[PDB]
Structure formats: C-alpha cells, structure tokens
Design a protein around this ligand. Structure first.
Ligand code: SF4
Ligand code: SF4
Ligand SMILES: [Mg+2]
Lengths: 312, 393, 312, 308, 394, 312
C-alpha cells in the first residue's frame, strides 16, 4: 500500500507518557480534556489508553493517546499513534531509557512536567530530531497527581476530568501548539485555575533547525516465539523485562552507616540486592526505585534520590 | 445525548435503559469495564437491580439461568476463556427458552495469555442456539443490547442472545454515542413475559428427564424457534429506526456494493476499516465494496444467497483461529460458501485470516486483500482457499 | 415462620412429593425428598442438580413435585439457586411481581454438593442468599452406576474403586466431611445441621429451622442407598438407624461454634454390625474394619460423642 | 421397508427381569446364549435395554439377544420389536407388563417359577402367537447373583452363568434348541445348574392358534418439555407393576400409629379415619412399611397370590 | 490377537491398556462411564500400572492430564454430553501448549433436558480447539483409533491432542466382535511419548508465558501448520497399522458402493453402517446408491473430499446433531462439505439430513426416504430446501 | 529435608526468582514469590494460575523463574498441580524417568484459591497429592483492575464495589476465611498455616515445613497490594505488619484443632490505624469502622488472640 493512499492530512496526533498507577489517570485526563475541547470546536476526536500497557503497574511507563482531525478519522482501530505531533511527559524522569520521540513529525512539541531548567532536560534528551519546541511546566507545584480506582478499563471516571496535574500540563500544551482553544479546555476540566497557571507559566523554547531528520510502519511489526511459546528459565536475570527505566528515584547507600544487617536485601521484591563482603550491592539495571529498601533500612544508610540527579 | 464513551460504557447504558432486574458480574479483560460501570450505576441508584458477585463465568450464566427462569430480565457477560468456561450452561439456557443476554467483548483464548481480541471465543458457541451478532462501533453495542432484548424476549422466539463486540477496538476505544432516552426504550422494549416461570401459585416442572423418543420433537421445536427469529428481527430493526432514528439492516451492512465487482465480507469493527479502504480505492476508480455481517446466528443463508450472488469474487475476513475447519479459513468462509453453493462456479470465494491474537487488520492488509480479489476476478481461479495474513498474503 | 413439628401425629398430611417416580424400591433419597417437601410446604421452589433425585424422579418427561421445580447442572446447584433468590428479591422490590418470597431449596447429591458442586455452594454461602441448601448423601455417584464420591466411605466398593490384588480395600481414600468444610469461613452462614431419614421428625424440624433463618442454611442428610450399598430394599430405615448408632453418621446442629447433639444414644455399636449388612464392604478384612473403627472414633470425638463402643 | 430390509432367519430374544436384584442374570442369559451361538458360527448381539438404565430395584428391565446365520443388519437399535423367545427371570412379570407385545408365530415364553403352567396362563389371558410356554424352578438350582461389576457396558468380574441364568438358559435350549447344550455349558460359570434347568424344565405346547406417526410425537411435546406440577400423583411413572410382593395389613393388629406412613418413599400410604390406606397403583412392594411396623400388623405376600 | 465380543467402552480400555498410559483421570457420566470402570479394574487387578486419579469433574479431568502431559506422561481421559462442554476451557490450552492428550468421547445429547441418547453435538462443539478428531462406527474401530491417534498425536511433527469419538450406546454399550491386539504389536506401532518441552528441574523451562498482541499471529500460525501436517502423518500411521494389525483403514473416507453410484449419503459414525445396509438392499431394486463415511473430522479433509466426492450427481449429508442456526440449516457436516465442494456447486447437488436427534435410532426406512429424495434431486437438479429434519419434514 | 532458616543473615543467598518482571514497584505478591522460590530451592515446579503473579511476571513472552514453571487456568491450579504429581509418581514407579520427586508448588491468588479455584483446591486435598498449595492474598482480583474477591475486606473499594448512596460502604459482604474452610473436612491435609511478607523468615520456614510433609499442604500468605489497596509503594512492609498488629490478618499454624500463633502481640492496635493509610477505605464512616472492629474481634477470639485493643 501507500501512505499517500490512506493519508489524513488534517489529523493531529498526541502521545502522553506517564507513570503507571500514580499518574496514569492524569495521562488519561490530558488526552480526554483535549479531545473534549476539540469536539467543542466541531472536530472529530478520539482518546484512549495504550491497551498493551494495561494493566498499568507502579512506575512503569504508560501511554494515553489523542487523535484530533477536521475530517472523519479513517484510522480509529489502532493501538498507538505512529507519528506523534505532540509528546507529553507527565513525569520528568521519562527522558531516560524511554523512546519518547520515536516517530515524531516535523514541527512537533515536547512538553515536560518538571521544575528543572529546559537546558537540563535537553542534556538528557540528546537527539531532538524533528522537534521544533521544548516546553517545561512545573505542574507538580500547581496541582496534585490524582489517584483513583474508577475510570479504569474503559469505564467512566467518577472523579471527573482534569482535577490534578492533567490541567496545568494540558494548559501548557495549548499555549505551545494551539491544538485547541484554551477557553474550550477551560470548560472541560475540574481545575481551570491550575490549567491557566500551566498556560501562563509554561516555558517554551524553539529548537535549532533539524533539516537532516529522517522520515517506517511501527505497528506492523510482529514478534515470534519458540515452540508453543515455551522459553528457557533464566539463570540470573530476565532480560525480557528490564525495569530500570521505571525509576523516578534510586537508593543511595552510606556504607559508613550501613550495619550490613541485610534487612533491605530480604525485602526487595525485584531481587536487586546482592550480599557482598563490602555490604549490599544494588542492581540499577532492574531497580524500580520503589523505595522499600530505604523504608526498611533501620540505620538510615539508604536515601532516595531523584533519578535526574544522576548522569547515568 | 451524544457522549464520547467506550463500548463498555455504551453497553452499560443499554442494560440500564433495559431496566434489567438481575446482573451477575465477574472480572476478565476486556469486558470488565461493562460490569464496573454497572456496579457504579447500582451504587449511585442509576439502576435498581440485584448485582450478584459470581464466583466465575460458569456461575454467572448459572445465576442468570435461574433468575431468568424466575421471570426476571437478566444480564451478564465475559471474554475469552471466560466464555468457554461457561460453555456448559449455554444450551440449558437455550433449551429452556430463557432469553438471557450475554455480552461478549472478544478475546483470544489461551494459550498463552493474550488480552488481544479474536472472534474465536464467541464462535465456539455458534451451535448453542442463541441469537448472535457483532457490533462494529460503541453506538451499535448499545443499540444491539436493546434490539436483542426485544427480539430475544419475544414470545414467538424466547431465545438467549450473544451481544458481541470486538475486544479493545470497540470495548475500550472511545467513540461518539447517542444515548437513547428512557421514553424511547419504554416504547420499544416490552416487559419480559415467558411461557414458563417458577411460581408456587402456578407450579411447573422445568426440564424433566426425557427418553430418546422425545428427543427429536424437542430439538425440532427449538429449531422452529430459531428459524422464526429473522422475521422478528426485521420487525425490531424497523421499529428501532422509527423510534430511535437509526436504520440497521437486520442482516448485511452493505457499503458501495451496487456496482462493485469484488467485495470483502466479514463482521466486527475491522469491517469499518475495510469501508474506509474501499472508499479510497473507489477514488482510484476501483469497483470494490464491503458487506458487513450484522447477524451471525441464526445465519442468514437465503438473504446472503440473494444479495451477495452478484459479485465476481468475494473475500471473507475471519478474525479468528478456527483450526482444522474446511477450506482452512475461518467459520465465515465455510458458512458463506455453503450459502452461495449454487453459484459456486460463478462467484469466486476466498478466505482471509487476519487480526490474530488481537493484531490490527490494517488498511494496507485490506488493500492487499482487495488486490488479491481483483486478480481472482480477472483469472477466475482461486489458487488456495485461504490466506493467513501476513504470512501468506 | 414454620412451626415445630412435635411428632408423626402432628406432621402435616399434605404430600408435595407425590407417588410416581422411577426411584428404587426403598430409596433413601426418595424418602428424603418426601420428608423435606412435606416440611417445606407449598410456597417452595426446588432446585435439582443432576443426580438420582433428578433422573429417577423425572423419567420420563414427568415429575412427582407438586411445587415448582427446575433442573440444574450438577456443577451449579447453588448458583442456580442464587439467581432465583436474586430474581425474587429484585422483582418484589421493583413491584414487577406480587408473589410472596418462597422457600428456596437445593436438593443436591453428595457429588453435586461436596465434589463438583462445592464451588457453587460455598460462593452462595459467601453471598448469603436466603436459600436452604440440602445434601442427600447416598455416599456415591449413584445414577451413573454407583461410582466413588468424596463422601464414599473408606474401603467401599464402587465401579471406580473395585477391590483387587493391587488395591485390596478397593477405596484407599477416607471421605470428605462437607458439613465441617462449610461450617467455618462463611460469615453469612446462619444454620448448619446433619439429619437422617431414620429420624424423620428431626429431619423435618431441621428443614423448617433452616428455612426460618433469614440467610443461607446447609443440611446434610444421610440417605441410605439399597442399590449402591447393596442391602435389601426393606432394610433402608434399619441401615439409617445403624449408621447413627455406630457413629458412621452423626446427628447434630452446629450453631455459634459448638455442636448440639440431636439424638441421645447411651452406648455405641462397633462399625462391624453396620458394615456386615451391606455388600459394598464384603471384601474387607478385619484390619480394614479396624481402620474404619479408628476413623469413626475420631469423628465422634470431634463432635463430642464420648460414649463407649459396646458390642451387641 | 418391511419386506425390503427383512431378516427372516434372524432370531430375537427378550429377557425380562427385576432391576438390581436380577438384572445380572438377565444379562447373563442373553450373553451365554450369544456366546454359545458364536461358537456355532452365528452372528450374534447381546445387550441390555439402554432406556431401562440405570436399573432401579424391582423395576422391569430387559436384556436382548439377536442370532442370525447372516450378518446382523439391524445392530444399532434399542430393543427387539418381534421376539421369538420371551424369558421371565421373575414370575410376577406376567402381571401388568407387556411381555408378549410383538411376539411372532411359534414363539416361546419361559418363566422362572414354582407355580404350575395353568396358573401362569390365567394371568396371560390370550397368548396369541405364543406356541409354547415353559416353566423352570431356577430359584432351587441357583441364586440371583448381585454385583456392581459388569455395569454400563463394562466387563463382569463375577463371570457368566454362575447364578440362575444357567438353569434358565438351560430351560430355553430344552424347548428351542437355539444353541447346542454343550456349547452353553462351556460358556457358563455354573454348568451343573444349567443342566438341571435343561433337564427339569417342563414344556407345554399351546393349542393351535391363528397367526396375529412421530409427527404426532412433535405435536405431543410441550413448550421446552415443561410440565405442570401434579396434584395427587405422577401418572407419567406408574410403579405398581414393580411388585414381586405386596404389603397386607391385619386390621385386628393395626394400632393406627402411622409409623409406616412416615417411612414410605413413594407416598403410597394415606392416613384415614378407618386406618392406613395403601396405594396399590404405585406401591413397589419394597417392604419398608412391613419392616418398621411396631405391631406386626403387616406381612409381605407374593404378588401372584392376588388376581386383581 | 484374541477375538472377543465386547462393548466399545471395553474396547477403548484395551486400547488404553496396550498404550501403557501413565496417567488416567476419571469421572462418571453415561454413556462413557464404562470405559473408566474397566480401567479401574485393570489397575486394581494389575493389568495396567497407571495413576488412577479421581477427578472431581470433567473440567478437572482435562486439567489433570494437562499437567501430567506437561510432566512427560502419556495421558488418557474422556467424557460425554455436558461433560464435554464443561471442560471446554481447557481444550485450547492443551493444544496450544502442544500436549498430545487423548480424550475419548462417547457421544450424548446436551442438556436440556436430561437425555442419555447420543448426538454428535457435544464433540462437534470442540471443532475449533485445534485437536485431532474422528468418529468410530464399530467397537473394533474404537480400539484401533485409540492406538492410531496416540501415534499421530504424539508424533513429534504433530504434537497435538486427539478426540477419539464413538457413538453413544450404539458403539459404547452394544457388544460387538473385536480383535484385541498383542502388546508386541503395539510396542512396534506406538513409540514412547516425547515432547519438545517438559517440566523438569534439571532442564528448567517456562511453559505458557503471557504474550502481547504482536506475538499473536506467529504462535497461532505455528499451530495452524501443525494442524495441516496431521494428514500426512495420519496416512503414514494407517499404513503402519495395516502392516502390523492386519486391518487397513482409510485416513479420510470409508467408501461403500460409490464406484458407480449416482447419489450417496455422507456422514460419520455408527449410523453410516446402517446406511451401508440400506444402500445394499436398494441396489437390489436397481437404485445405484452409495455411502461415504467420514473417518477424520479434524482436520477436515477438504481436498481429499473435493477430488473423491465431486463425481456424484447428488450428495445427502447426514448430521446426527443439533447445530442450531448454522448456514443451510442442516448440520456442520453439510456446511463444511458444501464449502469443500464449492467449485462444483452447479453440478454436484447437495442437501442435508438431520436425524438421530436425542439419540433416536436412524431407521432403515428413514435412510430409504433419504435415498429417494436424492434420487429425485439427481433427476431434476433442483433442491427445494437445503435441509430436511427427520421425520417431521421428510 | 529442608531445614529451618534461623535469621535474615542466615537465609540462603540463592535467588530462584530473578530480577526482571512487570510487577508493580513494591509489589507484595512479588516479594512473596521471591521468598517462596528462595525457600523452595532448585528442585521445584511452580504452577501459576492466571493472575498478577502470572501476567505481571511473564509480560511479555518471558519469565523470572529459575526453576520450571507452567501456566494454569485460574480455575484449575489444584487440578494441574494434581497431574504433575501423578505424572511424576507414575513415571518414577514405571521407571520411565531418572528424575527425583520435586517440590510441587501452586502460586494462586485469592481468586484462584478461595473463589473460582476453591473446588480444584479442595479436591486436591481430598486426593492427598504431595503438593504445596500457596495462596498469595492481595485481597482482590488485582490483574483485571482490582475487583472484589471473597477475601476482599468489608467496606473496601473496588471497581465492582464502589461507594455510592445506595451502597455507602462499597462492599457490604464480609470476607471468606479460606484457611479455616479447608482446614476441616480434609483428612489427608497435613499442614495449614498463614504467613506474611512482613515476617520473611517465618514465611520461608512455613514453606519448607509444608514441603517437608509427605502429603498436601496449604499456606495463606498475606501480600499487601500498593496499587489495589492504594498506599505508597515503599509502605508495603509497613502495611503488612500493621495488618497483623491490628488483627486484620492472623499469623498461625493449625495442627489438629490447635491454633499455634506465630507472632506475639501484647496489644493490637485498632483497625482505624491500619485502614486510614489506604485509600480503599477512605470512604468509610465511624459507624462502618466499628463494624469492622467487631468483625476483627470475633476473628481474633476464634484463634485465641485475647489481648486488649489499645490505641497508639
Ligand atoms: S405401622 Fe403397623 S400398626 Fe402402625 S399404622 Fe402402620 S400397619 Fe398400623
Ligand atoms: S496490582 Fe498488586 S499484585 Fe498486581 S503487580 Fe501491582 S502490586 Fe503486585
Ligand atoms: Mg488477588
């Protein structure tokens, strides 16, 4: 087939990345608020959560999508947006170990929820590719990350739409891209005051021209398994699920305080601690930064430190 | 009132509008959202019903079996291995003529665990004697819920129904839905009154052991009920258009078939994708069309025979793994070829198996399907009866 | 509110289980069904999981029940009952019926209560439906040609446990005690009791006591099977009374954590006097009898039967 | 279809017995004779009536045999429609049971009984195509074997022809010669009793006698099989003909305690101002009422003693 | 081996005994119960050394043998009617995990109401599950198919579970002559069970991990290829069975008087033998009729039927089942035959006969009326209706 | 035999549950699986009924188990675990394998143990297979989006039991006590115990004690669920200890009518100190809290916990 034959020239794509459980709802609320604001403008819209990311786990990267067009959407039944025009990061640490910019189209915008400088973020990204704008908004200082058991698996959310950080972040998206009218976005969120803070206080930088950025079919890829899908048992590690990129924080040890009681070691659900003659050794390849080891450490040898504090 | 809701929520409103008296829940992806919404509706007093927490799918149908025999309008649902776990209860429900409605948000059967959708799960129940059909949109998931209660609970029918909808693609993905008013449904859906019921004031023995001699009369009796469904379904689809303003064809949702040479025949949400591809091809001059099957059981043999015997070649999409079946496609290919058998030398038929494990049936794949069909239309020869996409096409 | 029955003289004359069924001459479960139906009265709906008291009673295309009755799968007796209770409580509340709330009774065999029907039973007790669940125990899968069940006694001959060189006792396993399986762990459980056809008045009073409960109730009834156990058809009541007198079956009400013995027996006959009269035990050796005697003594002590075992 | 698919040289045997207590011997009779005929190069088929399964105590049950010189083309049926040999393992079966339905000219009825032939004839009335009636006292030569083995198609671990099946089958051969007596002896567990039956059997030749849709079935079957709850009795299963014996009460001994009333599994006892009334339309003669009576007012009496 | 008059149940048990089955899971349900009673006797009398597990239900039965087959044991279980549908959830896991479990099915009508008579409805419900499936018409064939399906199923090129089906009562209960083979013959015919995965701590494997939709098609297609390779292996088995046991089976169609037949009746199981009897009697009248009995139902021999049955003027398909709402309103066999013979749809006329409902006997007269209909259709080339329900419509 | 573990420091270094699984950060059941695997050793076969510890561990097409593992339906964990045991006994007796008899362990969730898997569980106990059946209890159907289960506490919030004006507490039903359900009526049952991830050494010791039995054993392990119960990921161990310290979960061993308590609490905190930390109970009024306290007091008295209830 041809991309020209099934082209939808007036279709906009939005991809939101978030942390599972703790921020998945706001991810949902961002794409829901924008589609409800666009529908008010007489446009054809579609919002949904990444089905393969379901069920979301704590701190696992999860996605929510939006498709907004002035013409009828002839591509409704998909799993993901193949070519995002807007990429949104609900949590800042998602600039590490996660393909957030894969597929982005020219003139695109990246919006990040963070208190850290734009320059700091751009040092973690590296290749900005087809991006035209990098945007930061301190959404955590404007609202709270909402957590509910409602609105899951397609059911309606009983906590409404956009009461938390979804509102300032969505407000920041609009000021950068103008994807919908801000006054329409105001009418669909439960926290319009925070939204207007995000709209007003977001910082937008236009990136230097990238004329050598390339122009695939991501969702057409299959993955074949062995006989009957049976796999050999791992010996030391399961590389089929590397969970290091779940971290928003990591445990740092003060070994002069550590008594080597190995209380942390027996309680780690992910087996990331190994006993040594030098004391406990933490596996950063798989560590999810859950913080249990820090919480059970009785000597205070362990402390949680934000992931972006490390040049790793 | 038009809202952007999932197929799950769409079904829930249909149930709510039906004023169902008994519901039995149990969780399984991707139908779970249906019960969650229903659970909230009962909690908020949006619906007065007994919300029974079933210990499993087998119990779900069983609870729903007894409640229906007690004269209550009932609802339940499941997905994948849940549908097959309850398999034992389906025929008892049908044979006792209890118009139970079971919503099915499709999902691939084990093994291994896969949340993606296939029509395989609901198609295992095709012999069970239920009314069966697939909704391709969230709007139709609601509409079919109302229609099937009307047709199913009809005293000329009194048969259980499978309200099917594609997993995720319909059940999860949000879509524009016109939610009917409580006044419209009251004019469309009459109260459930069966020919038998458990009542100490008119005591009846429901389902006594029979000898083999009594076998043929009973099986033929239910058969006469199954054959009479189509007529009742025509009345309900006409009545739905009048009251609600949406005109559904009781058998085939046809698109650009008037002067089409080749078409794609199938069911479910992936058919809506096929229409889009067909329109794009029409913009290139290609005389291609699409026929979406709205009624899987009772299968519309004669209706299909009259309406689809005007095309050179017909491609049948089967979003399922019906292993070992004749012509090695899926069920729809086998049942379409049976229907057009008299025209087997003129109308070429070929099977397309795709969307396995819940994968997307893409525009590209539909394009390659239409192109394969054109080659068949030119040559009049079918090299092999089925193509398993993308491996073989 | 069903009144207490003082005697056979004070028992109701009305039969709701009428003559005309293909049940064995001297069928224990048949008398069970008659007695239970007699006590239940007209405002009653019976649920019949597949078994003798379904097939033997309904052959062919007929039935002896004067009140409503519906077939249930052997797997779902409790679930089918739950739905009927749910329907009636819903229909009455929603003014869609003017019928009064009926007695709802499940007449399940041991297989459909202890084995393949346990899951549906336990869940019904958990949800606390207003249902009386009754198990008639003939200690086998009778209607299928007498096969072993979890209530089949140790060393009992069935077509699935035949005595041979490799397994002399025939059945190795000791039976499951269902009344004690369900008596604990289910908070909504209002009434648990065992009964016997040997004591008919006690049987009818226990059935009524359970029906008077506002929640679920479970009654385990010993119903000797002259076919399966292989004793003369005119010995069924004799076998019922010997079972209680030898401790092979214990009559009690379990309420609020303590057993209340229903029948006062001063001594106890050795199990030999009970087993010698049924040919399902004819293959057993005195060493096998001893294993049975010890198992029974433990059973009797568990419910508080502390009387001496005295030979006749 | 009658003439076209006819198998004229095929023989049909119908053995009637009481369920549980005698179904083993009934099975053994048709098994012994077919196994014997197979030794003579005959095409044979023996089976138990499937619709009579599972057998209940004292219910009339059947076992069939088909023996032909040609391959049996009517294997896959349920029952013999035109019996040439009718065997009754229990004598009370001559009462209220269609034992002679469909019999053909030259047919033989064989009855296990101590009673005379003339008495048996009184219950039968018009024997029609029946040409011979045979009586044999199998109860004196062997016993009714009872077992849980050999049920529902499974093999019997008690063997073949150990009980009253051997003397009965011997009485069959003595009248029909359908197999060789030595072949029958070679396939039974108890040949000694077999030869006794083959010897002591009494045979009378009856006087000269002259030779003797399912769409409606659809029309008969109610909605989903649902039937109304009966008020007084279930006439779909009349069980009076199960009796090998009946309870007889002595009104001089009866105390009207109605102990028997509460223990009858078939609700055949009604409390009246004149005492207990027994329902002989349904009474199975199980004998529970007799076993529980405190006054000894009840006695079990052989059914054929009552010519009602 | 020794010829004896035995029921199909006992015939199956002997097939199981000779197979040296390692694990057997039992549960009673008429008319298949006798198979387990006979096996329980063999284990009790020391005729077979196997673990005899008393499953608490049919769902549990298939689950037990699921686990046992994964641990490397050759397994056997079976059921009837609602027992087959009760264990429905486990069928697909067994095949997709490539565990060559064998399940015997003595057919019985599904509820409601209670009915001990046979229909093929119960077993035909499992036709999508990805198992090998066929119907035995004689007690002899029941034993033989037991040995055959183990070899084909446990074949390392196949590794698929098998349904060995036989007509309830008619085959399972009615005694018939059976040639019980020797242990030396079976050991020559049936190799020990070896799979490509097993549960063994020495060589740890993870069997059945959750997959994503992207992994869907390859795994499904992987099983699709295994299914299409069955026919080749089945042919190699039937030739081996003829060379060892002296009985030569056709892997697809048991044809009778079809060489010069103008109309034939197509179906499977015991009632087809009666069709052969009626056909032979009708030949004496001048009616040139024949019978085609399907030996293998899954995987459906689509092409073999296309080149072997396309030479008749009319085909009457017997469906001893209640496949409600199906296309052409006959049964499954009719729909799949018409699908197979689609190319010759103008020439070869097809009609479906539904009979034997609720276990009712399909009489000689009924078969005669079927042949008379086919005779009319062949002459006129006109099918007034695609199905006839016996005896109400024909 | 597997001998006792004396302490954390004297625990085995070996991990048979390796890093790399899509489980929530701070996942209670994940730690349960790790401790169980560490205690069981290399001669072990895990049976995983469908649930979080199946799906979350294997997503996608991989697995963390160093020992053999096989998928089981949520309906047949006990039956699947009956087959492998039967297979291994037969293959060994018939000399078809040189493998040794392995530890056979079921890791079912509460749903697959107390609800939809109970029947298969109870039957396995009846047949007396040498199998350890473990229930990890996160008190919901977690993988499907946190739905109510029979172990789900009263008044708890799930997507099937949301708080509304009709049902103010969300869930009206009180939990089913599955450890007590199966502890009676099953003569073959060797060992019944409850455990908690809060006491890892105690947990592992109970596993090994259960494995050392030559027969069936059942262990009910309390494993807090940060997603489902809605509490911080690093508070998992704190929640587990508070569960025991408030009597919401009891630690004991049940040997022949005797409740052998595993930990010593001199005074248990009120339920409110445990429930206020979870958002699943955030809707409950003081009138509901009292009802919970009354239930816990009865639960604790039943196992002999008679210490006073004293606020912190
Ligand atoms: S038990 Fe005996 S004394 Fe009492 S009423 Fe009956 S016949 Fe009369
Ligand atoms: S939902 Fe609960 S059990 Fe499941 S992975 Fe998350 S924390 Fe673990
Ligand atoms: Mg759980």
């Amino acid at each position: 087939s041809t991309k020209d034959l099934f082209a939808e020239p007036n279709l906009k794509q939005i991809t939101v990345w978030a942390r599972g459980v703790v921020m998945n709802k706001d991810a949902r609320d961002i794409v829901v608020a924008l589609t409800e604001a666009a529908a008010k403008e007489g446009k054809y819209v579609q919002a949904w959560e990444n089905y393969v990311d379901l069920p979301d786990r704590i701190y696992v990267p999860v996605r929510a999508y939006a498709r907004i067009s002035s013409d009828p959407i002839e591509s409704k039944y998909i799993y993901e947006n193949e070519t995002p025009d807007i990429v949104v990061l609900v949590e800042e640490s998602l600039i590490k170990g996660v393909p957030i910019l894969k597929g982005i189209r020219p003139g695109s915008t990246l919006v990040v929820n963070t208190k850290r400088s734009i320059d700091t973020i751009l040092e973690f990204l590296g290749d900005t590719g087809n991006l035209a704008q990098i945007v930061t908004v301190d959404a955590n200082s404007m609202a709270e990350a909402v957590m509910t058991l409602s609105g899951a698996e397609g059911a309606t959310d009983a906590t409404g739409i956009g009461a938390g950080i979804a509102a300032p972040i969505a407000g920041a998206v609009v000021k950068a891209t103008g994807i919908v009218d801000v006054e329409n976005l105001a009418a669909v969120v439960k926290n319009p005051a925070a939204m207007r803070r995000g709209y007003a206080e977001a910082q937008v930088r236009q990136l230097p021209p990238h004329e050598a950025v390339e122009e695939v079919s991501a969702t057409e890829l299959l993955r074949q398994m062995p006989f009957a899908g049976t796999v050999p048992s791992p010996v030391t590690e399961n590389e089929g699920m590397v969970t290091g990129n779940w971290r928003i924080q990591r445990p740092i040890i003060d070994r002069e305080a550590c008594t080597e009681c190995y209380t942390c070691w027996i309680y780690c659900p992910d087996s990331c601690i190994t006993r040594t003659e030098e004391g406990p050794v933490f596996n950063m390849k798989y560590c999810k930064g859950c913080g249990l080891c820090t919480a059970v450490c009785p000597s205070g040898a362990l402390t949680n430190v934000p992931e972006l504090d490390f040049k790793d | 009132k038009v809202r952007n809701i999932s197929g799950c929520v769409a079904v829930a409103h249909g149930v709510r509008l039906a004023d169902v008296d008994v519901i039995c829940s149990y969780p399984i992806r991707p139908y779970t959202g249906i019960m969650s919404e229903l659970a909230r509706m009962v909690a908020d007093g949006e619906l007065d019903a007994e919300f029974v927490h079933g210990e499993g799918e087998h119990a779900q149908l069983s609870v729903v079996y007894g409640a229906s025999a007690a004269g209550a309008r009932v609802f339940t649902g499941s997905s994948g291995v849940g549908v097959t776990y309850a398999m034992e209860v389906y025929s008892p429900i049908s044979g006792e003529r209890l118009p139970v409605q079971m919503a099915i948000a499709d999902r691939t059967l084990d093994p291994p665990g896969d949340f993606g959708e296939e029509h395989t799960d609901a198609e295992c129940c095709r012999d069970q004697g239920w009314i069966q059909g697939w909704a391709s949109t969230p709007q139709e998931a609601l509409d079919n819920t109302l229609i099937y209660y009307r047709v199913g609970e009809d005293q000329r029918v009194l048969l259980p129904q499978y309200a099917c909808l594609d997993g995720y693609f319909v059940s999860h993905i949000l879509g524009p839905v016109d939610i009917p008013d409580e006044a419209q449904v009251k004019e469309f859906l009459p109260p459930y009154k069966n020919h038998h019921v458990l009542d100490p004031r008119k005591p009846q023995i429901i389902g006594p052991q029979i000898e083999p001699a009594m076998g043929p009369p009973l099986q033929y009796q239910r058969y006469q009920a199954v054959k009479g469904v189509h007529k009742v379904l025509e009345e309900a689809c006409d009545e739905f258009a009048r009251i609600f303003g949406r005109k559904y064809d009781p058998y085939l949702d046809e698109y650009l078939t008037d002067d089409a040479e080749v078409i794609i025949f199938g069911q479910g949400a992936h058919m809506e994708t096929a229409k889009a591809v067909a329109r794009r091809l029409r913009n290139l001059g290609e005389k291609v069309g699409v026929a979406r099957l709205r009624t899987f059981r009772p299968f519309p043999t004669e209706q299909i025979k009259e309406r689809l015997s005007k095309f050179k070649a017909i491609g049948v999409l089967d979003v399922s793994a019906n292993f070992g079946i004749s012509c090695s496609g899926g069920v729809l290919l086998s049942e379409l070829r049976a229907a057009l058998y008299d025209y087997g030398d003129k109308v070429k038929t070929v099977g397309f198996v795709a969307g396995l494990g819940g994968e997307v049936v893409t525009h590209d794949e539909f394009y390659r399907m239409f192109q394969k069909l054109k080659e068949i239309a030119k040559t009049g020869k079918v090299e092999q009866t089925s193509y398993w996409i993308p491996f073989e096409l | 509110m069903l009144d207490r029955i003082a005697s056979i003289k004070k028992a109701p004359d009305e039969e709701y289980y009428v003559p005309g069924h293909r049940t064995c001459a001297g069928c224990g479960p048949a008398l069970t069904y008659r007695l239970v139906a007699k006590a239940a009265g007209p405002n009653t709906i019976f649920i019949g999981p597949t078994g003798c008291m379904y097939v033997a009673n309904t052959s062919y295309g007929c039935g002896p029940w004067r009140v409503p009755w519906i077939h249930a799968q052997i797997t779902n007796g409790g679930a089918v009952a739950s739905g009927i209770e749910a329907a009636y409580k819903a229909m009455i509340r929603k003014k869609k019926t003017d019928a009064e709330f009926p007695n709802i009774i499940v007449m399940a065999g041991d297989g459909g209560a202890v084995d393949i029907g346990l899951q549906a039973l336990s869940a019904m007790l958990y949800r606390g439906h207003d249902v009386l669940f009754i198990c008639y125990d003939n200690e086998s899968y009778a209607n299928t040609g007498i096969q072993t069940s979890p209530t089949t006694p140790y060393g009992a001959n069935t077509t699935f446990t035949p005595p041979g060189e490799v397994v002399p006792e025939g059945k190795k396993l000791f039976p499951k005690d269902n009344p004690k399986v369900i008596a604990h762990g289910h908070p909504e459980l209002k009434y648990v009791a065992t009964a016997s056809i040997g004591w008919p008045v006690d049987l009818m009073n226990k059935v009524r006591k359970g029906l008077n409960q506002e929640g679920p109730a479970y009654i385990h009834i010993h119903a000797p099977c002259p076919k399966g156990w292989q004793f003369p058809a005119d010995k069924t009541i004799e076998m019922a009374k010997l079972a209680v007198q030898t401790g092979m079956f214990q009559l009690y009400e379990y309420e609020n954590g303590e057993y209340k013995l229903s029948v006062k027996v001063d001594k106890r006959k050795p199990v030999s006097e009970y087993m010698k009269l049924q040919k399902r035990f004819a293959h057993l050796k005195p060493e096998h009898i001893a294993k049975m005697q010890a198992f029974v003594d433990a059973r009797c002590a568990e419910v508080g039967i502390t009387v001496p075992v005295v030979a006749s």
